[PDB]
């Protein structure tokens, strides 16, 4: 039952993509308030529109100096992996290859 | 980059009653489930204070009588009972994109009894008139409501130009406002006449406040 | 615990620059980010920007991109901005805010930059003595520049009944006046002495209230 974390988080790895199509995603905590819930959203390139989930089942910061890792669903195609609040807030590019 | 209106500019509110004041964004300002528009009160003189963050989330010691509502694009602010103290300008904010983005401000007024104002006149110092200069100041203090008008007569002839007002902030404790009239002129001018006269003219009477003094 | 100490107010020349100063203490100051808010006089809040000082990163409101410049020191726990090549636009008070959560939790007091090429002078201070049952006197702060001045009565032992209005500016120079209301029994026995301080010009005037007869 945790809030949202409110700092900031650094990339520890780079977006990879898993032989089942998912992302992988490290990032770590810079902040604190810690235990709490990553801020993570996929979004359209307008950024309008929530797309694709999140595999990993509610992402909690739960250690000092430490990456979390987070696996999602992206969206076929364009779309940004956005994590944690403003002004630190990561906005990273993906383009998934397929159609549904 | 998105756009807070509020809504009204300005409210007067009686003590005890309930104030609700109205922030829109031009576009949602959500992210993650939750909405990324606060609220903040500036007294006068002091920086703005944070009332609620997250649209309904009220920081740690502030009082239960503020209350924060709204999703997407529309929110409020609700101040229930209204409270002497509460004499500020409101302020909502969106931080669900950068650049962060405030809206113009609701400024609320305490809206307590009519009262008229205490007027005093006092003549150019001694010292003021040995370095060349007159100014002749008027107080008109503790009043209710704000609009007032000060006319100056000079041997009871009308004068608008030399004249400079300054108004205080609405009171924190009486909800009162006061000001300050001075009309200054030169030695040459002050010595030439001897009737100086401040009138105001208030809500609390059709019969205007004057308050006199003679050179001599 | 959460404190942010500003500058003092500063005036400077069209076309120069100031650099502003924002001392933190009470809590870690490389975890969040510190943040500045520009308010011109009667006018709203402008963000311009962020610093995370644990790394330097900042965000800025395009418009102020060119015109401010966010700096952090880890080891005095102090944020700094610039402001270049000044104009009446830029004479503002600058706030610094801590964005301890989801907004900013604690402030600043602000630092006052007056963009101007009027030069500081001292006021002069003059006595407002009546020309029943409660009296009211005066001080009269004519001709200063910059702001503030500060204003008390009795070393600040009358603070009761005190109405010390906004400067007015006419011609480079700033008017002020100030009234006290005490009891007709106490004056001119207990005397009433207005104390007004200019720290431009380094001024400390005492002005004792004289009936005048
Ligand atoms: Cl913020």
């Known amino acids: 039952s945790y809030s949202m974390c409110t700092g900031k988080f650094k990339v520890v790895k780079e977006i990879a993509e898993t032989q089942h199509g998912t992302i992988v995603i490290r990032v770590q905590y810079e902040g604190d308030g810690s235990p709490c819930k990553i801020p993570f959203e996929i979004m359209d390139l307008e950024k309008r529109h929530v797309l694709g989930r999140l595999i990993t089942v509610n992402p909690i910061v739960t250690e000092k100096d430490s990456p979390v890792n987070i696996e999602a669903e992206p969206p076929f195609g364009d779309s940004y992996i956005i994590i944690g609040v403003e002004p630190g807030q990561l906005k990273l590019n993906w383009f998934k290859k397929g159609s549904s | 980059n998105i756009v807070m209106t509020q809504s009204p500019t300005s409210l007067a509110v009686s003590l005890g009653q309930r104030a609700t004041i109205s922030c829109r964004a031009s576009e949602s300002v959500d992210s993650f489930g939750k909405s990324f528009m606060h609220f903040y009160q500036q007294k006068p003189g002091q920086p703005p204070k944070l009332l609620i963050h997250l649209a309904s989330n009220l920081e740690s010691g502030v009082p239960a009588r503020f209350t924060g509502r709204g999703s997407r694009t529309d929110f409020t602010l609700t101040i229930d009972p209204v409270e002497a103290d509460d004499a500020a300008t409101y302020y909502c904010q969106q931080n669900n994109e950068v650049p962060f983005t405030f809206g113009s401000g609701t400024k609320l007024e305490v809206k307590r009894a009519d009262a008229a104002p205490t007027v005093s006149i006092f003549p150019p110092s001694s010292e003021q008139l040995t370095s060349g200069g007159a100014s002749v100041v008027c107080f008109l203090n503790n009043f209710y409501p704000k609009d007032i008008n000060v006319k100056w007569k000079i041997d009871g002839s009308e004068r608008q130009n030399g004249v400079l007002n300054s108004w205080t902030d609405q009171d924190s404790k009486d909800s009162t406002y006061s000001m300050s009239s001075t009309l200054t002129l030169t030695k040459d001018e002050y010595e030439r006449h001897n009737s100086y006269t401040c009138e105001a003219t208030h809500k609390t009477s059709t019969s205007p406040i004057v308050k006199s003094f003679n050179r001599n | 615990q959460v404190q942010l100490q500003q500058s003092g107010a500063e005036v400077a020349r069209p076309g120069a620059s100031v650099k502003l100063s924002c001392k933190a203490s009470?809590?870690?100051?490389?975890?969040?980010?510190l943040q500045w808010v520009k308010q011109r006089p009667g006018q709203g809040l402008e963000w311009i920007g962020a610093?995370?000082?644990?790394?330097?990163?900042?965000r800025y409101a395009q418009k102020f991109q060119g015109k401010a410049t966010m700096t952090a020191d880890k080891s005095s726990s102090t944020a700094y901005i610039q402001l270049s090549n000044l104009a009446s636009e830029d004479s503002a008070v600058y706030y610094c805010a801590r964005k301890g959560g989801f907004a900013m939790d604690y402030w600043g007091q602000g630092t006052s930059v007056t963009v101007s090429s009027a030069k500081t002078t001292p006021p002069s201070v003059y006595p407002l003595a009546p020309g029943n049952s409660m009296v009211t006197l005066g001080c009269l702060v004519k001709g200063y520049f910059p702001e503030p001045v500060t204003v008390t009565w009795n070393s600040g032992s009358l603070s009761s009944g005190v109405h010390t209005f906004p400067a007015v500016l006419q011609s480079d120079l700033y008017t002020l006046s100030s009234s006290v209301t005490v009891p007709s029994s106490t004056w001119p026995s207990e005397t009433v002495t207005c104390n007004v301080a200019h720290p431009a010009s380094s001024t400390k005037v005492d002005k004792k209230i004289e009936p005048r007869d």
């Open positions: 009470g809590y870690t100051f490389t975890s969040y980010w």
């Open positions: 610093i995370w000082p644990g790394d330097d990163d900042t």
